[PDB]
């Protein structure tokens, strides 16, 4: 059973999503006045709290909750206060979409969920519009084509002492109410677990950058078939060896003056996909300008024209440090994508990253074999709240989730 999700405006079965023709809302429309301003009830020992992200103590409290109680044996992800700043506070973020529960008696932070604004293209997917054209339903299929200003949810976390108490449903209801008070009625979110009901699912992939280190810290092993070689580690270092420097002329760190051209080339690329974000210059600046410890972004520029760029973000892990790079956004116009991403690998390796990770969204499959990525055990599932949407392949998703 799904005692909570069965009550919510999401598709209830996979079959439901294989039969959805057009994008659009699931609930009939409501007004802001229909939504109460009183927060959702919670037990007397607890209080709702809206953290101030301009206050070092508040961001510290969030950091400590997630440090000990977020997604899980030899490694522990570390989401720094700077990383959390970055992820939670994009341009025009809404402070009360950062929703916390604290214990009244001692003010201990015990649960959290965050929404941030995103503008998303989420109209009827290409293959569904062809079926609609065939039936004279082009209009119904195109109704929701305009990019929509919605909520992206992340960092749901209930302290271990409060697990299995149905507090996550109360956090979800409360953030839903706060989003609906701003006249927003859809959200996008992801999870590594299967809930009702994803519109897309992609496997994770990894590429070792420093296999000697990975093996020493027991993050990677030496696979069975290398064990047959005379020198298994030299063969492993060989498989994954990278140049010391890239060979593409004009590759450099992205600067503020590159923002407008990066925005243009990224938006031209992301328009190719069924679901994807639309970013203003301020959002390009926020999400892509280099930020020590967090985001790394490079452009290929010559003659004052930016023709390509790539970005990756960092999530380090405590070894019970593993320095992981995650492919972020990119756009190639002057070179094959695999060469742009080779340059990403070379730069990440040079900066001391140990592994590069991605999910098979965007065109990430296109360079897997040649760049020595391997499939991993996880899948990232994409979901909408209050949005009927056909199943799509992960290569039609262009939204990277931090
Ligand atoms: C219009 C605006 C709309 C805005 C809102 C949109 C929707 C946003 C939705 C949220 C998106 C967040 C995405 C995101 O953050 C990225 S996925 C990362 C989620 N966080 C973690 O895994 C952290 C570690 N785990 C915990 O903190 C707890 O185990 C959590 C909090 C996960 C569950 O706490 P608990 O104490 O273990 O469990 P109960 O309180 O007793 O609740 C059990 C109910 O929770 C459902 N559950 C479990 N995991 C979930 C997950 N990852 N998403 C959604 N639902 C999840 C579960 O199916 C069950 O419902 P059911 O009985 O019907 O099956």
Author numbering: 11 to 82, 86 to 333, 340 to 421
Paper text:
LdNMT was co-crystallised with NHM, a non-hydrolysable analogue of myristoyl-CoA with a methylene group intervening between the sulfur and the carbonyl carbon in what would otherwise be the thioester linkage in myristoyl-CoA. The refined coordinates have good agreement with the X-ray data extending to 1.42 Å resolution, with Rcryst and Rfree values of 14.6% and 19.1%, respectively. All 64 heavy atoms of the NHM are clearly defined in the electron density maps with this ligand residing in one side of a prominent groove running across the molecule. In its bound conformation, 1070 Å2 or 88% of the cofactor's solvent-accessible surface area of 1215 Å2 is buried by interaction with the protein. The most striking distinguishing feature of LdNMT is the additional pair of α-helices C′ and C″. These structural elements correspond to a prominent ∼ 20-residue insertion at residue 140 in the sequence of the Leishmania NMTs.
N-Myristoylation by NMT proceeds via an ordered Bi–Bi reaction mechanism; binding of myristoyl-CoA opens up a second pocket for docking of the substrate protein.
